[PDB]
Write a protein that binds this DNA or RNA. Structure first.
Ligand SMILES: [Mg+2]
Ligand SMILES: [Mg+2]
Ligand SMILES: [Mg+2]
Ligand SMILES: [Mg+2]
Ligand SMILES: [Mg+2]
Ligand SMILES: [Mg+2]
Ligand SMILES: [Mg+2]
Ligand SMILES: [Mg+2]
Ligand SMILES: [Mg+2]
Ligand SMILES: [Mg+2]
Ligand SMILES: [Mg+2]
Ligand SMILES: [Mg+2]
Ligand SMILES: [Mg+2]
Ligand SMILES: [Mg+2]
Ligand SMILES: [Mg+2]
Ligand SMILES: [Mg+2]
Ligand SMILES: [Mg+2]
Ligand SMILES: [Mg+2]
Ligand SMILES: [Mg+2]
Ligand SMILES: [Mg+2]
Ligand SMILES: [Mg+2]
Ligand SMILES: [Mg+2]
Ligand SMILES: [Zn+2]
Ligand SMILES: [Zn+2]
Lengths: 87, 25, 125, 100, 96, 81, 129, 208, 216
RNA sequence: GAAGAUGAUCAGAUACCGUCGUAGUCUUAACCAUAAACUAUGCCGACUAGGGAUCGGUUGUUGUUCUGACGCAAUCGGCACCUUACGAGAAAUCAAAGUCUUUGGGUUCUGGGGGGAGUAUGGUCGCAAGGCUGAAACUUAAAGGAAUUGACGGAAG
C-alpha cells in the first residue's frame, strides 16, 4: 500500500501461509515457521542456509500441516516419492 | 393457577354466558 | 498421628538437595549438622527436621526417591545406565541370519531396491 | 432447558411405543422409557441349598433358577436406588456400571 | 432461503406481507384505527379545557407513601370526566 | 487433504465408487456370450438381465433374473464381450 | 430443487476456499458459470479451471490460489441502470479500490469497471473480492 | 536435492524391519493414509519404511537447522521412550523432557522448568498431547513419531513409525541422533559405523 | 530495574529488536509489558468502564472491581485490557498491563484517492463478542469517527481519522462492545487485498539471527 | 375404572391409600378435529469433518459351520450414535441450530414487551361438548431465556 507520491505507507507487510496463502496474523500463536537446513555434497548441513516454510494456525489445527510439508518439500526437492498428487 | 384449570374455568364461564344469552335469544 | 508437615518436609529435602555428601544415616550427626547449616528457631523443630532428613537419607540409600535431586543422583545414573550387550538382540544373528518378516512386508522390501533374505511367516489370523 | 438429547427415553425413528406397568406402583410407562432389569436369582437361598440337598431324594439334582425381567418407572427406580442421580457429565455414560 | 420470497416478480407478496404484519406494531395500529380520535379523552388534542368538579386526594403507589392532590374535571368539548394532577407544593389551594 | 488431483483420481479409489459418482458416470454392467452345454450358439445376454432369456436353438432357459446380476443355469458358460 | 447452478458453483468455491483446499469440483457447468469464472480468472481470483464433458450438463474442476475472499450470486438478478451500479458497489464491495460486481449486459458478462468503460448496463449477476 | 548417499541403506532397512517399525495400528486415520503401504490380513498396516526413512532425514535436517542444540526439546511420557529421549539429549545436546510434562512449561514463565524451545520432538502425539497443546500457544513447531492411529493436530513433521514398540522407539530415536550428528559433522561421514548400538536407547526394566 | 525472563525480553533489553513490527512479522508472543514500554514509549490509556461484580457467599456478597482499559499510540497501535481486582486502582493497573501486552497493529488505508497519509480503513471489517457485532466502514476525509463514545475512543487511540461504525446487539455491554471493535480493528491485517498478493520471502526469525543474545 | 358408594389418615379432606363400582374401556354405523399431535427444529436443492456400529438392496471375497448362515471388503438408501469445533450460538448446545454485516439457491407458514385474552363481538362448522376466524377499552416496567455463585430440599453419595 502506497500513497500518491509513491512512499510505502504500509507498516508490517505480513507473512502468508505456504499452504493456504492466508495472512499470518500478529497474534496467531498456532502458526509456525519451519526451517530446513541445506545440505552440501559431503552430507554436511550448510550453516545459516535454510529452506523456510510458514504454516498458519488454521492448517496446523486441522492437522494438514504434515501433508502440506510433504507436498511443499517434495516440490522443492527436499523429499522424494513421499507425497502423491493423485489420491 | 394451573393453566389447564384456568382454561377449564373460562370454558365453564363461556358456557354460562351462552346459556344466559339464550334465555332472551 | 505423627504426620510431618510441609515446613519440615521441604526443609528436609532442601537439606538433602544441598548437603547430601555431608549428611549421614545417623540422627545425632544429622541433628548437629543441621544446627550449623540452618537457622532453626526451636530445638523441637530442629529435631523434627533432622529426624525426617535421616528418614529420607535412609530411604535414598535403598534406591532413588521421587522429587529430590542432589547433584549426584544423575551423575551416578548417567554412567549407571550405560549397559549394552555385545550382541545387538536386533542384529540378525539370534535368528538363522535373515529376517522373519511377513510375506506382505517382503513385497515392500522387493518394491524398494533391496535384496534382503527373508523367512516369510503367515499368521493369517 | 433440554436435559437429555434422548429426552429421557429411547424413541428415535418411531412415533408411539406401547406402555408397561411399573412393577412397584403399576404406573403406565413407555416401554422404551422404562428402567428394565433382568434378574436370574437362585430359587433356594445359599443357606438352604445344603439342607435341601440333604433332604433331596435325587443324587445330583440341580436347583432351578428364577428368571425375571423387572420394569420400573422413573420414580420407582430412583426411589429404590436402582438408578441414582448422576453429575451432568456423568449422565452421558451409558455403559453398564462396572461392578460385576 | 430466509423464509420470504426473493423472486423478481414477488413484489405483491412482499408488499402484502408487510402490510399484514404492520398491524402487530401498536403505533401503526393506533394511528390507523384512530384510537385517539375514538377513545382518547382529549380526542387527539394536546390540551383540553374543563370544569373542576371536586378536589380529590389519591394515595401514591408502593413503595411511595403520599397523597397526590388531583381534581376531577369534566371536559367541555365532550363532557367526559378525567382526573388531573395539580403540580407543585400547594397549588391545590389555587384550584376551586 | 488440501491439494489433490481431482481430474486424475487414483483408479483404485475410482473403482470403488458408485456408478453415478465417478467423473463421468459409466455402467458397471456388460454383455455376455452364453454357451449352453448342449450346443454351441452365440447368444448375447445382458449381465443384469431381467428376462429368463432362452437361446434360439434349444428352448432352454439361460439365466434366471435376480436382484442384481442374472444367474446363469447349470452347464451354461459365459464370456464377456 | 436446483434453481441456480451459478449459486451452487460459487457456494462450492467459497466452501473450498474457506477450508483451504486448492481445488474444487463444480457440477453442473453452464455458460454463465464459465464466463463468471473467466471474469474471476482474468482478475486473478482463481487459477486454471477445467471443463469435463460427460455428455450432460458437464463438470468443472477449478484451481484456487487463496486470493479469493468471497464470491457470490445476487438473487434475483435485479435490473441495474448505470446510475444504480454505484449503489450496488457500495453495498457489496469491501472497498472502493478493489472488488468487482459482475453484471450480465447485452454487451456480455463483465465486471462493473468494464461496464463503465463501455457505458453499458444490464442485470446484476454476482460479486467477487 | 540430495546426494544418493542419503538413500535408505540395506543395513538400516534390516534394522527397521527387524525392530517391527513397519507394524502400524489396526485402524488408520485419514491423514496417515499416504504412509500405509498395505494392510496385513490380520489387520496391522504395513508402514512404507522408505517414507519413514525420508521423514527421518527431513526431521533430522530440521533439527540440524536449529542453531542452539539445547533449543530442541525431546519429549516422551511413555516409559518406553524415556531412555531413548535421554540418550538423544546426551548425544545431541538437546533438552530432554522425560516422563511427566508439567502443564505450563511453555506458557507459564514463572514455573521452575519453564523452557522456550524452538522445536519440540514428540514420541507419541496421544500421550504427549500436553506438549503439543502448549507448543501451539507459543509458536513451536512439532515433529512427532506417529503411528497410523496417532492424531495429527498441531503436528508439522510426522515420522511414520510404531510408537508402541520397545525396540521401535529406541531405533527411531537412535536414527535421528545418528543423522543429526552426521549433518553436524560430528560423525565424519555417512559410512563410518557409529559407536552407539541400537540396544542403547532401548527401555530397560528396573530388573536388568 | 527490569530483568527479562523471556528470550524476547532479553532481545528487547538489548538493541536486537527495535520495533513492534518485527514482533508482529513473526507473531512472537509478548509476555512482558516492559517490551511494549520500551518499543512504544508514547502510549495513552483510558479507563473506559469500571464495574462491580459480586459473588454470593454464605455470609454475603463478595464484591470485586472490574476495570476496562484501552491503550494506544494514535499511530496504528492499540490494545485492550480487562482485569478484576479487589481495588479499583489495582484493577486499573493490571488492566493497563494486559492492554499493553495485547497491543496489535492496525492497517490504515484510503477512502478513494491515495493522496497524503492513510486516514481510514482499507476495507470493511467486523468483530463479534457476545451478542455485540461492531462493523467499521471506510469513510471520506471529512467525516470523523462516526461511532459511539466507547468505540470512538478506541478508534482515536488507534489512529483512525475517518470511519463509519455500526453496532448490533446489546451494545450497552461495554466489555463486549470494546472486544468486538478491537477484533474488527485487528482484522485489517487479516483481510487479504490485491496489493498484498505479492509473495514475500520468509525472513529468519530474530530469535534465530540473535540466538546467542537470547540464550540466558 | 371418571361420577358415586364406602374404610382409613387428618383440624378438615367427599384427596392421596384400601374395597366396590356407573359411563367409558372393545366392536358396528356415523360425528367430533383437538394433544408437551414434540425432534417444542417447515419442505425442496447444493456444499463443508473425522469414526465405528446398525437395517434393507446390490457387487466382490474366507484357517468358518452346515445351499444357507457367518466372516472380510465396497457401495447406494434409511434409524441413529461417538469425537472435534472449521463454523454457529446469549448460552445450554448444534454436522446442523454451519456455508448469516464478507448480510441474496427456491418457496409456504408464523412472531413483534407482559397482561386483558384465545376473552367479547360478528361469521362459519358441529347434535352437543366445542373447533376455526378473532378485537378493543383498560392496565403494566418488566414478564421471560440460558448460565453463575450461594442458600435450601421430607434428593443421592
Ligand atoms: Mg428442570
Ligand atoms: Mg406422540
Ligand atoms: Mg427471477
Ligand atoms: Mg447458460
Ligand atoms: Mg441485463
Ligand atoms: Mg436495538
Ligand atoms: Mg374423610
Ligand atoms: Mg372396579
Ligand atoms: Mg361409544
Ligand atoms: Mg378428536
Ligand atoms: Mg394446536
Ligand atoms: Mg417427544
Ligand atoms: Mg407449536
Ligand atoms: Mg410445510
Ligand atoms: Mg439440506
Ligand atoms: Mg446451496
Ligand atoms: Mg448391508
Ligand atoms: Mg451398484
Ligand atoms: Mg454432537
Ligand atoms: Mg441431531
Ligand atoms: Mg404483545
Ligand atoms: Mg432458569
Ligand atoms: Zn410414578
Ligand atoms: Zn441352448
Amino acid at each position: 500500500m502506497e500513497n500518491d507520491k509513491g512512499q510505502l505507507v504500509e507498516l508490517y507487510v505480513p507473512r502468508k501461509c505456504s499452504a493456504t496463502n492466508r495472512i499470518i496474523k500478529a497474534k496467531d500463536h498456532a502458526s509456525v515457521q519451519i526451517s530446513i537446513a541445506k545440505v552440501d555434497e559431503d552430507g554436511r548441513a550448510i550453516a545459516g542456509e535454510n529452506i523456510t516454510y510458514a504454516l498458519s494456525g488454521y492448517v496446523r489445527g486441522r492437522g494438514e500441516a504434515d501433508d502440506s510439508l510433504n507436498r511443499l518439500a517434495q516440490q522443492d526437492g527436499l523429499l522424494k516419492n513421499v507425497w502423491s498428487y493423485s489420491r | 393457577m394451573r393453566d389447564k384449570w384456568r382454561k377449564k374455568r373460562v370454558r365453564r364461564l363461556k358456557r354460562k354466558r351462552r346459556k344466559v344469552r339464550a334465555r332472551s335469544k | 498421628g505423627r504426620v510431618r508437615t510441609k515446613t519440615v518436609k521441604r526443609a528436609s529435602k532442601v537439606l538433602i538437595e544441598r548437603f547430601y555428601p555431608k549428611l549421614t544415616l545417623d540422627f545425632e550427626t544429622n541433628k548437629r549438622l543441621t544446627s550449623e547449616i540452618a537457622v532453626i528457631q526451636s530445638k523441637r523443630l530442629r529435631n523434627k527436621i533432622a529426624g525426617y532428613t535421616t528418614h529420607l537419607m535412609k530411604r535414598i540409600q535403598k534406591g532413588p526417591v521421587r522429587g529430590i535431586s542432589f547433584k549426584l543422583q544423575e551423575e551416578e545414573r548417567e554412567r549407571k545406565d550405560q549397559y549394552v550387550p555385545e550382541v545387538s538382540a536386533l542384529d540378525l544373528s539370534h535368528t538363522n541370519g535373515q529376517l522373519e518378516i511377513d510375506a506382505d512386508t517382503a513385497d515392500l522390501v522387493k518394491s524398494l531396491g533391496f535384496k534382503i533374505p527373508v523367512q516369510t511367516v503367515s499368521i493369517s489370523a | 432447558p433440554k436435559k437429555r438429547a434422548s429426552n429421557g427415553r429411547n424413541k428415535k425413528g418411531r412415533g408411539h411405543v406401547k406402555p408397561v406397568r411399573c412393577l412397584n406402583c403399576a404406573r403406565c410407562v413407555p416401554k422404551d422409557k422404562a428402567i428394565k432389569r433382568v434378574t436370574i436369582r437362585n430359587m433356594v437361598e445359599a443357606a438352604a441349598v445344603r439342607d435341601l440337598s440333604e433332604a433331596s431324594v435325587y443324587a445330583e439334582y440341580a436347583l432351578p433358577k428364577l428368571y425375571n425381567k423387572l420394569h420400573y418407572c422413573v420414580s420407582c427406580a430412583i426411589h429404590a436406588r436402582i438408578v441414582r442421580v448422576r453429575s451432568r457429565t456423568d449422565r452421558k455414560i451409558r455403559t453398564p456400571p462396572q461392578r460385576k | 432461503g430466509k423464509g420470504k420470497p426473493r423472486g423478481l416478480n414477488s413484489a405483491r407478496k412482499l408488499r402484502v406481507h408487510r402490510r399484514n404484519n404492520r398491524w402487530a406494531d401498536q403505533a401503526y395500529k393506533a394511528r390507523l384505527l384512530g384510537t385517539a380520535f375514538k377513545s382518547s379523552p382529549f380526542g387527539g388534542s394536546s390540551h383540553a379545557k374543563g370544569i373542576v368538579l371536586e378536589k380529590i386526594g389519591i394515595e401514591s403507589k408502593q413503595p411511595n407513601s403520599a397523597i397526590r392532590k388531583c381534581v376531577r374535571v369534566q371536559l367541555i368539548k365532550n363532557g367526559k370526566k378525567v382526573t388531573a394532577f395539580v403540580p407543585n407544593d400547594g397549588c391545590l389551594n389555587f384550584v376551586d | 487433504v488440501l491439494v489433490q488431483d481431482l481430474l486424475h483420481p487414483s483408479p483404485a479409489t475410482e473403482a470403488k465408487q458408485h456408478k453415478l459418482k465417478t467423473l463421468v458416470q459409466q455402467p458397471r454392467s456388460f454383455f455376455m456370450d452364453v454357451k449352453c452345454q448342449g450346443c454351441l450358439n452365440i447368444t448375447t445376454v445382458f449381465s443384469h438381465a431381467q428376462t429368463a432369456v432362452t437361446c434360439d436353438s434349444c428352448s432352454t432357459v439361460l439365466c434366471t433374473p435376480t436382484g442384481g446380476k442374472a444367474k446363469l443355469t447349470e452347464g451354461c458358460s459365459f464370456r464377456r464381450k | 430443487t436446483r434453481t441456480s447452478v451459478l449459486a451452487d458453483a460459487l457456494n462450492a468455491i467459497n466452501n473450498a476456499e474457506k477450508t483451504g483446499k486448492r481445488q474444487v469440483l463444480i457440477r453442473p457447468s453452464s455458460k454463465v458459470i464459465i464466463k463468471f469464472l473467466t471474469v474471476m480468472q482474468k482478475h486473478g481470483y482463481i487459477g486454471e479451471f477445467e471443463y469435463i464433458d460427460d455428455h450432460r450438463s458437464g463438470k468443472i474442476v477449478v484451481q484456487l490460489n487463496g486470493r479469493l475472499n468471497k464470491c457470490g450470486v445476487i438473487q434475483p438478478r435485479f435490473n441495474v441502470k448505470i446510475n444504480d451500479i454505484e449503489r450496488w458497489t457500495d453495498n457489496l464491495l469491501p472497498a472502493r479500490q478493489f472488488g468487482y460486481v459482475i453484471l450480465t449486459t447485452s454487451a456480455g458478462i463483465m465486471d462493473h469497471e468494464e461496464a463503465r468503460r463501455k457505458h453499458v448496463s444490464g442485470k446484476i449477476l454476482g460479486f467477487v473480492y | 536435492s540430495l546426494p544418493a548417499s542419503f538413500d535408505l541403506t540395506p543395513e538400516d532397512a534390516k534394522l527397521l524391519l527387524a525392530a517391527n517399525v513397519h507394524l502400524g495400528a489396526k485402524n488408520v486415520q485419514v491423514h496417515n493414509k499416504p504412509y500405509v503401504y498395505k494392510t496385513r490380513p490380520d489387520g496391522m498396516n504395513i508402514i512404507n519404511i522408505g517414507k519413514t526413512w525420508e521423514k527421518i532425514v527431513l526431521a533430522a535436517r530440521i533439527i540440524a537447522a536449529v542453531p542452539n542444540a539445547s533449543d530442541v526439546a525431546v519429549c516422551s511420557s511413555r516409559t518406553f521412550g524415556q531412555r531413548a529421549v535421554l540418550k538423544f539429549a546426551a548425544h545431541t545436546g538437546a533438552t530432554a523432557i522425560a516422563g511427566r510434562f508439567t502443564p505450563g512449561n511453555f506458557t507459564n514463565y514463572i514455573t521452575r522448568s519453564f523452557k522456550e524451545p524452538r522445536l519440540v520432538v514428540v514420541t507419541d502425539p496421544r500421550t504427549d498431547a500436553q506438549a503439543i497443546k502448549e507448543s501451539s500457544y507459543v509458536n513451536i513447531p512439532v515433529i512427532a513419531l506417529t503411528d497410523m492411529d496417532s492424531p495429527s493436530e498441531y503436528v508439522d513433521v510426522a515420522i511414520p513409525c510404531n510408537n508402541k514398540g520397545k525396540h521401535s522407539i529406541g531405533l527411531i530415536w537412535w536414527l535421528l541422533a545418528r543423522e543429526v550428528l552426521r549433518l553436524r559433522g560430528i560423525i565424519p561421514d555417512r559410512t563410518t559405523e557409529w559407536s552407539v548400538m541400537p540396544d542403547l536407547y532401548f527401555y530397560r526394566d528396573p530388573e536388568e | 530495574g527490569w530483568t527479562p525472563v523471556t528470550k524476547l525480553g532479553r532481545l528487547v533489553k538489548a538493541g536486537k529488536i527495535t520495533s513492534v513490527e518485527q514482533i508482529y512479522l513473526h507473531s512472537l508472543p509478548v509476555k512482558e509489558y516492559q517490551i511494549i514500554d520500551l518499543l512504544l514509549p508514547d502510549l495513552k490509556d483510558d479507563v473506559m468502564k469500571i464495574r462491580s461484580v459480586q459473588k454470593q457467599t454464605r455470609a454475603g456478597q463478595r464484591t470485586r472491581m472490574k476495570a476496562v482499559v484501552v491503550i494506544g499510540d494514535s499511530n496504528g497501535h492499540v490494545g485492550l485490557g480487562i482485569k478484576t481486582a479487589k481495588e479499583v486502582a489495582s484493577a486499573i493497573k493490571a488492566a493497563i498491563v494486559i492492554a499493553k501486552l495485547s497491543i496489535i497493529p492496525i492497517r490504515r488505508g484510503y477512502w478513494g484517492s491515495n493522496l497524503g497519509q492513510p486516514h481510514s480503513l482499507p476495507c470493511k471489517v467486523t468483530g463479534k463478542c457476545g451478542s455485540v457485532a461492531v462493523r467499521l466502514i471506510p469513510a471520506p476525509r471529512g467525516k470523523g469517527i462516526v461511532a459511539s463514545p466507547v468505540v470512538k475512543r478506541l478508534m482515536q487511540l488507534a489512529g483512525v481519522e475517518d470511519v463509519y461504525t455500526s453496532s448490533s446487539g446489546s451494545t450497552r455491554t461495554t466489555e463486549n462492545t470494546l472486544k468486538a471493535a478491537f477484533a474488527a480493528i485487528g482484522n485489517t491485517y487479516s483481510f487479504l487485498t490485491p496489493n498484498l498478493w505479492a509473495e514475500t520471502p520468509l525472513a529468519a526469525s530474530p530469535l534465530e539471527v540473535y540466538a546467542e543474545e537470547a540464550a540466558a
